[PDB]
Symmetry: D2
Subunit: 466 residues, 4 copies
């Protein structure tokens, strides 16, 4: 009873040794590994410190103008500030753009938008998952609706041309006339090229639909001006605050304000619809500590250092890509305009399914992903590789060329093991063959060692070993 007050003041290290130890091991794992998973990054110490603030305590349902409770003087300064920085970072005129900074994450932001502009059973069109689309843009089969987007709304995907790897805008244009979407989504999870927002706006307008961009993956590149901005043609732009923006996990919803079209002119009614959908529609108390973190990240994102960082991200990807091509690997669309590339491993006689597991055992992180061709999702041919994470650690072109070779050594190893299993062997048997065969296990150990020694050469953003 007396120690209750001490309990509240006791550091994590002393209070919960078990959780503390987990964080420590995790921190060390991140340090000695090579992060190539495209959606991964490292938040700055500043951002992380914001999350532990007393901002966790205040309930502030509503918005700066109208909150359900009082005592929000400072919470209001914060959310207002965060909104100012968000618009600023993207060179947006507050008279043409507004922004909601309360979404809990990327998926919640998207859903708030659908709930506001689409409504139950409204039609939505998004990039097909196997072609690089995201779950939240629609995901269903001929017998079931899996994603909440597909469950509560009516979704239909649009594909990429498998012979070029590019989104087939022509086919989408024709299909939109028959499907009658209320909203079209411009955003991807695994696509290395810029999106033709202008074309998509024409198609959207033609069908009277809204054009929503989900820039989650390129949000950081956009700020630095390294890839064309989606704010030029879209009505709404959703995004995560982590990934390439490098903040804590959260989301934001940018929306247009003012005149939409002439004749006499009609206006944008996006603002109130979106805000009401976020609250009291879908969420409760906003997570202010996360809003401060996002704010901090937005300030850092406007610095020339961040600008230079993003140029480096894209340059590294180009270098990594060229080095892999020189090694004989096939890159979808032949290359990239951004931070990632999709490597078609068919060019090496294997698949991303087996490759990702072998590379993981070597402490090289990345993930499998189907290539536009692929006649089966149960054996994706590609590997998605992104440069954001390692670039935040200071890796430059030369470093990524060395990384390309580690990955290659990995693919060679994966091929070795596969040939040692059989043509009709299962992924489970493959994984087991890799775990219980000292022969391959020796190869793994040796490559892991080089991979981790090379990784330890670079700093690990965050708190002092936390």
């Amino acid at each position: 009873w007396s120690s209750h007050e001490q309990m509240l003041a006791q550091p994590l290290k002393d209070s919960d040794a078990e959780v503390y130890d987990i964080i420590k091991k995790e921190s060390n794992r991140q340090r000695v590994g090579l992060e190539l998973i495209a959606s991964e990054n490292f938040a700055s110490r500043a951002v992380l410190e914001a999350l532990g603030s007393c901002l966790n305590n205040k309930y502030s349902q509503g918005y700066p103008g109208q909150r359900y409770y009082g005592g929000t003087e400072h919470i209001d300064e914060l959310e207002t500030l965060c909104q100012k920085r968000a618009l600023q970072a993207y060179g947006l005129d507050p008279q043409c753009w507004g922004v909601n900074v309360q979404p809990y994450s990327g998926s919640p932001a998207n859903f708030a938008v659908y709930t506001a502009l689409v409504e139950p059973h409204g039609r939505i069109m998004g990039l097909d998952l196997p072609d690089g689309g995201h779950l939240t843009h629609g995901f269903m089969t001929d017998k079931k609706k899996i994603s909440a987007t597909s469950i509560f709304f009516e979704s239909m995907a649009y594909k990429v041309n498998p012979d070029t790897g590019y989104i087939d805008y022509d086919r989408l244009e024709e299909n939109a006339r028959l499907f009658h979407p209320k909203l079209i989504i411009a955003g991807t999870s695994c696509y290395s090229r810029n999106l033709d927002y202008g074309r998509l706006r024409k198609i959207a307008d033609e069908n009277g639909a809204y054009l929503m961009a989900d820039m989650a993956h390129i949000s950081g590149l956009v700020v630095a001006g390294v890839v064309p901005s989606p704010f030029e043609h879209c009505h709404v732009v959703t995004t995560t605050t982590h990934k390439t923006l490098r903040g804590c996990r959260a989301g934001m919803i940018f929306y247009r304000r003012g005149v939409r079209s002439v004749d006499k002119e009609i206006l944008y009614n996006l603002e109130s619809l979106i805000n009401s959908a976020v609250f009291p529609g879908l969420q409760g108390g906003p997570h202010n500590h996360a809003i401060a973190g996002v704010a901090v990240a937005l300030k850092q994102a406007m610095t020339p250092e961040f600008k230079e960082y993003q140029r480096q991200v894209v340059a590294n990807c180009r270098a990594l890509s060229a080095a892999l091509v020189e090694l004989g690997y096939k890159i979808v669309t032949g290359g990239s305009d951004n931070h990632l590339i999709l490597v078609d491993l068919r060019s090496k006689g294997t698949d991303g399914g087996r490759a990702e597991k072998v590379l993981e055992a070597c402490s090289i992180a990345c993930n499998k992903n189907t290539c536009p061709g692929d006649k089966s999702a149960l054996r994706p041919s590609g590997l998605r590789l992104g440069t954001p994470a390692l670039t935040s650690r200071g890796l430059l072109e030369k470093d990524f060329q060395k990384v390309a070779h580690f990955i290659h050594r990995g693919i060679e190893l994966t091929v070795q093991i596969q040939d040692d299993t059989g043509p009709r062997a299962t992924l489970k048997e493959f994984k087991e063959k890799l775990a219980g065969d000292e022969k391959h296990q020796r190869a793994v150990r040796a490559l892991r060692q080089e991979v981790e020694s090379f990784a330890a050469l670079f700093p690990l953003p965050g708190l002092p070993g936390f």
Copy 2:
């Protein structure tokens, strides 16, 4: 780059002076004010430290043993551990109960459950908002569906008896037969009494519906065994991890496993699939560690003692207000809060909350079962969790009751000066634009803040 590395290692104080200053002022505001808003609390230093961990960086869609990406060895140890502590804290047998610890907050947890068990347009019944219910349990008018629960599903509320302030279980029993709910919700935002879970389970079973408890507000009291547990009769229990549980903001979904009545439970896979890949993306592992830390602290006898104190304080605050002539809805409370009917003093919570706020006494308005209009709620909701975390005891809450009373008297004054009939905007002007009054506020604020500064403020060292 030279400076790029340092930008990422730089402290918040130096990196972003503006945000830092805001936190500082906020920290100070919390310190000198008296927090009586029932859903507020103070997270421990340990919990807050977890949020700043490198756990922020890892993407772990899926679940332990079912991850999309590799490299989740430690994230798995964490989520698994968090689940173990969640079941443990509530004395739940892992063969009868399972738990999802990925919800981003209270509302997201509820929605995941509806999406899993109810499905589009499925019927849901919950306590009517004006009678103390929560938005996420249903909120619509005769012309519009406001809450996402009411938009994507078909909701119908059940009311409390305005003459007793208690949920009218009889009427709910009759209406369930006509409405045919697929799910009934047992949980509140402003109700001072224990819920008759057993009765609700009978009604749910009768209609073949699921009984979901939303213990967000009493989750902490439940752990300490200070109020009956909803795990005894419900099929599912959702909850926030903050509020009375005192963790960081997040949510959890407890669900039954095993035999239901041979017929088994299919809750687990439905709920997990709804959370992901259904509604969410990457879980927030730093928040999961925070919840884990909070669950360990919640099993300590200190936490147990804390919760007893919370309820004792509420009883004391309640008695002191009754002695001062205030009317408490249902006459008293079984938990951490009370709904004070200000009609007994000739005013409303709408005007009272603003005057008390100006005096640095935080609380909020809320309609009382009677109330013939939501635009003039008669009550004030007051909770003891926050101040109890600061060490306040019965004697302290009696002093607090007096400050609140001085406040009510002041609100009434600004009311007599405005006339028996005046808008709320007129009242506020008289409050902020009257020598004697703005002066009255200043004087009470001073005493309120001096008394408040006598107690410690949980959290990180010095902001």
Copy 3:
């Protein structure tokens, strides 16, 4: 071809002997039986002749002045005329009322209205089936939506007070506030009392809902002014054109025009668009002519007198049964039918309807407000429209009451012989497989049919 032309000019008797024979036997069955099924009637020769017209051949999608195809000069004269007579028959000012005469039947008319005013998942409230409501007003269980109304829309029933047999308007008033209906239905399939349309309009307005009356059963009584008109308080009135109106099978949708409360009515275009191109295709013009013919006949004093006789007969039949010791739900009736609670004789409508059928006395079972099980309805619904069209008067219905009584006694007998507890299939065996009994049936059938043959059978000359 030589014979092809004649095949199309050939009479039914020569063309299809098998179908012809069926009609003949059916015609004879109708002649020698006693029709007491409340929804049955006999269409006049004039009405039937219209159905065989060349009006069958013309496709006229759309409406007068709004046709898809040309060549509708006469179809337009017809539909326009039919609309004029419909409004006229009910004393409706064409500036306050409009009417759609294309519905294929009663159910299609109701559905068109829901589709127009309610829309997918919109809420609808109607009388509970077991309390005398109609399928199309809502029909679902706790596990399944059976009626298309319950499948495409969200329905919730309102009940009658089992102690009085009257619709409990108070409870409906309270439930409407919680359910938030978009449309409330005033109409029944088995209810002997007038509906409190005024009360229902107050409740509808309070919730901003539309009040739709489904007068299918009393449409004829309404025309003759024998029961209060639903056109006084409702916004929409749907109806079958057969039953008590005595036309061919079809339906109509009456809707208000002008000012509702400035706010006007938008019913017309919504309803018309829902019927077409919404739900139907080419209208059945031969049926529209039949309805027109029936509406002209319905405005004659002869029809007026007929309807008075219908209600008088019901009163007489009712009194004779009461004198015989039978219990009538709500004690009596205001219209053409009565619901007889057979519990007062130790049996149920389920067994009674089958025995009476075997005696050539037609009627059907129906649950009484009390009834603790639909698998053993206690009542028998009896209507006087059909026999009244055959000329039966009070004295005749008293004789009919006795035949029915002899029937009930017989059903009870087959019941005593089967034991206080026996399935329905056992009862039927004893009925058809017992010297004394099948013999009892034969004897009563004979008297029933001899008495029935004393009256004329409306329709075409000789089939």
Copy 4:
């Protein structure tokens, strides 16, 4: 009060002179006009006599096995008989096919099927309206759902290739994979070619969807074996009972029974779902007089005379088509396989919108319809012409060649008037110019005379001038 009994026995002629007169004028209109509207026909006297039977009186909700009331001995003989004849007429084995004969019309039958197999918001794919599809197969715009099919369900149309006029099965195959239909509809309102049911079954099976044929327009041709049967590949076949089947207005639902697929095999659950949807789902008391009419029509449809009639129907269409082609008219898909043709009037510098009204004034009935090309529905280029109606009146090839010339004289007249109005004149102005200009009005009168004199040469099926 006394005459009440007389009132019930009074003939229509004496009872309601006004309605009687209308029928008479209508009967005469049908006699002197030339019916080319593809969905029109003339019911036989036998069929019409059935409609006036005492069958109008009996309420029989439910089905032969289970009715809500008793006294259905004969109604049961009737519905049972009608079902037997329906299956028989189409050479269907009652162990593989079942049939519901209670639908009130064509549209109600389709809706009962959607309600049974698709369910609320289920996806449905049908031929696009402007390409010859039917309303009940789906009809919506980018802002509104008009047809009840589009309101209660989620529909998406599939188009015909505008360069060939044929349904583009390839595109439909691709789109079905993205749309995930639960049911695909094979049926048309204005399409002159046979449907590739086999191809559609492959596509349906691929997506696990049901294949429903709506043979309303070719139902009669199918019975006579003049066009391939949809019962060979479809799971369900809906149809009107009038149109080419020549019965009274009603509808039927044919559905498969027995084994569906192997592996071990799964069965068809269509029967109970469809029956329950019709009742107590959507309808109330069946219209027995209409069921007898359908029965009578089904018996007549199995006669060699009917068989010969249908061959004549198709031969006439071929002749009408050739005569119009020789006159320089463009027929969509170049010709027809059935009872109708879609004439593209662009080949004559006018549209079906103006043409249908001029031809109507000349007592030549037909209707406008957009041609696959058409860049606007507000000016459809085609005229749909069917031969069923006139063929029932005995018209043969020579007769249809004369009809082709009357129609041509009509088109020439329509062109004359249009040129007399202006390039940007409205259809309303065109219609008014045709009604208030004695010059054109004289042309109309003269052609009408020839048209009606020639029409009076043939018999008019039905009752003696009724």
